[PDB]
Amino acid sequence: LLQAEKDRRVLQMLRENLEEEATIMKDVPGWKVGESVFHTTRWVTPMMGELYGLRTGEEILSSTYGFIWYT
Amino acid sequence: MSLVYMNIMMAFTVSLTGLLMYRSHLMSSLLCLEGMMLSLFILATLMILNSHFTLASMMPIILLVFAACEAALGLSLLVMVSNTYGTDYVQNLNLLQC
Amino acid sequence: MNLMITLLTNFTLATLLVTIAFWLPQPFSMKFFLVAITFLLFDLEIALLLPLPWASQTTNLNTMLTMALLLIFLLAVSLAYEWTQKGLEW
Amino acid sequence: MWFEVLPGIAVMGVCLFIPGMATARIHRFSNGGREKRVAHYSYQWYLMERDRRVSGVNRYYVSKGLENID
Amino acid sequence: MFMINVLTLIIPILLAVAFLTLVERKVLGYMQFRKGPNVVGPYGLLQPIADAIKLFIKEPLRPATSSISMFILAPILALTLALTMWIPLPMPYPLINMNLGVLFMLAMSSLAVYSILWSGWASNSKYALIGALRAVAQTISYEVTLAIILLSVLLMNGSFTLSTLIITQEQVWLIFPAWPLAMMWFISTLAETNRAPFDLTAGPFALFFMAEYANIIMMNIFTTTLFLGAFHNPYMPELYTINFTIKSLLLSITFLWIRASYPRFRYDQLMHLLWKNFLPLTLALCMWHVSLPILLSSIPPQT
Amino acid sequence: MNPIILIIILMTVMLGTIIVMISTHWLLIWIGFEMNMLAIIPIMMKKHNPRATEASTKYFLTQSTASMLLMMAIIINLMFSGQWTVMKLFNPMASMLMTMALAMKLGMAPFHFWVPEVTQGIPLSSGLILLTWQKLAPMSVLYQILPSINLDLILTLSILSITIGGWGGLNQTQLRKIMAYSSIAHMGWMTAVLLYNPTMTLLNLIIYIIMTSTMFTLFMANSTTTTLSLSHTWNKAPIMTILVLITLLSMGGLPPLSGFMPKWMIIQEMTKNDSIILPTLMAITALLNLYFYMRLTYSTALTMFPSTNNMKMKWQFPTTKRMTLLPTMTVLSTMLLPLTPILSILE
Amino acid sequence: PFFDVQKKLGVDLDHWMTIQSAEQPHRIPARCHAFEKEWIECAHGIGSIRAEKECKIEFEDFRECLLRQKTMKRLNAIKRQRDKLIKEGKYTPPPHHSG
Amino acid sequence: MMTYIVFILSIIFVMGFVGFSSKPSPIYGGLGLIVSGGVGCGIVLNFGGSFLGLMVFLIYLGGMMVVFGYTTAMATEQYPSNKVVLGTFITGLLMEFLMVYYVLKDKEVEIVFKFNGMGDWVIYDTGDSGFFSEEAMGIAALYSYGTWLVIVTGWSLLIGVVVIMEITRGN
Amino acid sequence: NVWAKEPVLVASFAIAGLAVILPTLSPYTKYSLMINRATPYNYPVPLRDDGNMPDVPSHPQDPQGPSLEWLKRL
Amino acid sequence: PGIVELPSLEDLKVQEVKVSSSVLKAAAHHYGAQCDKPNKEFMLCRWEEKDPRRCLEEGKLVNQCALEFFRQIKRHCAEPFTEYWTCIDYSGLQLFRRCRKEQAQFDKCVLDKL
């Protein structure tokens, strides 16, 4: 159950982040819109700056370093 | 690239230059060798924690214990140097010239 | 950083104590060195020994029993060696 | 006799009694009658994070009991 | 609320230490045929308040030291160790639930060894350096033995978490599966806190004194936690707080009572004693506590 | 000294060198170098003069910073493609630091300043064992890690090692400093051919270890530190003189004699590669490092210095020194010219 | 000389420490497990020169798995362009929980 | 009290290494190395961070600088600032702030690398079920599979004991 | 004979000798290995249905597979 | 190199089983017994094909099995299940030996009626 919820949540963050990229970078030259940097077309787990990126402080500090200095 | 690695390698090179140049005492030189030791400890440990390289995590504690007994041998040699002279200076070693 | 908050509170309250305590009233011997490196090498072997209660849960227990007894037996060999070779005597 | 050393022992024991009662009272007081949840392992942390996420108030101690099945 | 927890943990340690001074003076007094301090107020409590505030009033000897900043830096370190070092020790629910705290205990004791060495260097001339150097040696002689005995006594408990300890000491106290290991541990706690029968024979003597007696109360609290403790019922933990404080009080009285009636040791007798009597026996208890749980088919449930 | 303790420490030197040889893990290579250091330090200070104290101090500092720079290079290797495999590296920077750490550890002309000073103040057994095993142990590592090295590093170190080990030696009359300068020159020779065909380097390692064993055995047979003592040992025994002749000229490397085979085969599999000015420069420096051998010979066996008496007294007593294994290594070290096709014994 | 006592006596004293993707005690993977399996099987029985110049694709793919170099480069370029257009002031961003 | 706190502790780490690479009296050197080791412990505990930094805290900051100060007490005296030490400290702080400024207001400053200049919350796990704080069971596996390693480690330390007694006048 | 001179040494050697020898004779080390083996840290991963396997039961209530029944009987 | 193919939000919107986590632990054994039969199909899909965005339909199916299980346990006995999970809830980290007798009561409820 937790695995299914986590899969839906991370695909939700990926779709949100790529839509926000495709809106925000429509003026720079070059910039292929959503190409993964890797060559082999496989599902890779992202680097936790693509899931919790551009969030400004609260959720990223409670997410990456939350458990590390929680108690 | 985890930008912290840049400053840790810079601090490594600062500790290496502190190991090399020294004028007064051998003790501060051996202590900067201990600092260089700790620098390698910290850098390898941050990498093994980040990469989740979980089986061969022997490296930090084993590098620690081995280079610590290296420092113990260095303390024995420095105590012998301080025994066979009045002081333990970098100078007063002008016998056995190249 | 919450235990860092506790650390900061302890350090600052202690500095308040020290500054109120100060600004309101206004050769050698070789035998010392054997104990030092003796502590150092035995404390390093303690550093080897102490992750043993992490290790009791595995499916290969005979080798762990044998090598743990080997490590403590070697520590005993070192202690008995310096004991028999008049290492710490007076 | 030692009938009069017991006031000193009693006062110093009350001075040792206050952090236990105060700590337990603040732990039972800081989550509304609950206990402060511990997190040694990341499994319990992810469980606690989804618990504080689902409750809506962004506080884990409320914990949304059974009123949102359907 | 977190800084309120901090204040309620680190404010009453001064009251605890000063009332410990009156407790130990009255206990030594009734070990002797003495009353007192009882003339100054009701049973002498404002008398430790008064001599503490007098020693803060009383004018310091002007240095006459070297490296005044280091003379600052040593007792601030001792007292901040004594302040920071009651955190994971559970009065029923501890301040910070840690994955590991007992190695942190031993490392902070090693920092106290640093503070003693720095005070002995920065104090005065050569004889104070030699005396404090021997004191550092007889303090460092026991972080081998006490950490080894700690490892042996919680090998029967699996994890370092100390809440699994406060659980798994419910049935019998751990004094019964290790009585000689615990007795040698208590001797090593006398060595860590450095009182008689372990010898000693400057400023601020108040802060040196404060760090020592908070170290005493800390080691006896960790003694009570490490070896015994009754059953913990949630939604009434004041019972465990009362029983914890009572047994820590009784063991602190027993600690000072062991101080009260024995001569100090000769220094080489102390080193001879520690090495050639405790250290093979601690190793033997370690290896037997290794070989036992594989024979009782009971390794601890290391979560 | 106790013989049990010495045999145990010899066993640890053997164990450390075998762990350097066999282990596919980088940590165990570093542990082997460290254990080699920790055991080789009480081989020195076998006496109790401050000479051995200062010598072991200098050796310990250079040895330790070599070990830590090697660990630096390995942790950089894991900063890049990360696995503990003895193989091609993944960085010119990590390979650069690794070759410099093994040049400090080995003995090489930008880092060779510790070698004559450490050999001046030690007994000859300690010097023999340190020269043999400390020139043995890193060569296995370099033989393993050859395929990812910039050749400018190895070649500049080799050329500079041969010319500085040559130019030092003309002014020094201590026997140990002469042997140390010869060691720096031969390790330059054994470093130069590493990226071309390392079978030559390991065969030259075998030959040089045999040569050093014969040299320090012929100086264990008579407690000599200066050439004047060598003239007195001319007076007291004649066969030592002709063996100093043949073995010192075998260090010189002349074609009827066995020390020419490591030079000649190197020039063969060096000039089947199309560098030619580098072989002729190296071999002119091989002409250079023979004059101190030659004046050593002229001191010992081909001129006759005046001698002090009490050799009159010494002629009654036998030459009852024990030799570890002198004659086998002697005639293996001199008469190994016509066994040229024993190159293939190695790989 | 890299000897082969390791293979002749047969007891793998060191091969477990050596790479990732060995037998971890609790069977958990590393960060770049599948990339290592493909790179090791790509360069297994190959002569270490055409292994250098044929498996370079998956090797650089593994390197940017292990360090995530160009990925952080692209993320930094995203944040710099986001910073210059928020300095411009167009579309005060609802990437933080809002619309 | 913000996001780049591992970076800030790295900067104080380099501050400490410069502070005793300026070659002071060795008791000031030991003080600086204790400060550097404490903040390095802070860094490695901030990367999560269970055991290893609390392990180095007992050894170096528990039993190595103690022996270094012990040997500073028994061997040397340093009985009574200078332009050389203060000049090296100012040049080290200059190198520090120069690198920090030229990285923070740019992409990268390279010795030979490519340092992406931003905070190191990247990279980390995506909140997976680790359940044992990986390093703990990692060093727990040091005894089951670690046959050769602890044998040669203990043998090296036993030989270190006999080395120390021989050099300090065996027997 | 030696019990009067250095008694703590003899006591240490006796308890060390039993701590070495005593783990050999045991009806309990097999229980140690079984209990230590039977603790699932990881997920029990399923398998593809039919390589024509007349074993490995599908419902976890089915006792066809090797269950544990020496646990509840101590 | 090549673009990623990430699916749509209209397929990535299924109502979660938005229970809290302590009650989710407290009902876990009978959640694994009766239900969690077709999600080993889901987990085998995941471990064979390691692509979330490929095996999500069985994620929808385990979502609806969990929701149907919670509907069945809600509308019938027990209401003492509420007292049981709030009994297991506030006792720190959840030992099952903390609240055992109400576990027996809930077990007797579900055994007798269902």
Author numbering:
A (entry chain AM): 73 to 143
B (entry chain 4L): 1 to 98
C (entry chain D3): 1 to 26, 50 to 113
D (entry chain A1): 1 to 70
E (entry chain D1): 1 to 201, 217 to 318
F (entry chain D2): 1 to 347
G (entry chain S5): 1 to 99
H (entry chain D6): 1 to 80, 85 to 175
Question: Which lines from the publication concern this structure?
Answer:
Although we were able to separate three distinct CI open states using the standard 3D classification, we reasoned that because of the systematic worsening map quality along the peripheral arm of CI, averaging of particles with diverse angles between the membrane and peripheral arms was still occurring. Hence, we developed a strategy for the separation of different CI states on the basis of the angle between the peripheral and membrane arms. The focus-revert-classify strategy resulted in the separation of nine distinct structural classes of CI ranging in resolution from 4.1 to 7.5 Å. Of these, seven correspond to distinct open states in which the Q-site loops are disordered, one to a closed state in which the loops around the Q site are well ordered and the final class to a closed-like state at 7.0 Å, precluding the assignment of any of the active site loops. All six CI open state structures at ≤6.5 Å each had distinct angles between the peripheral and membrane arms. Whereas in the closed state, ND6 TMH3 was a clear α-helix (residues Leu52–Met74), in each of the open states, the helix was interrupted by a π-bulge midway across the membrane (residues Tyr60–Met65). Given that our preparation was largely in the active state, but many SC particles were in open states, it is likely that CI undergoes conversion between open and closed states while active as part of its catalytic cycle.
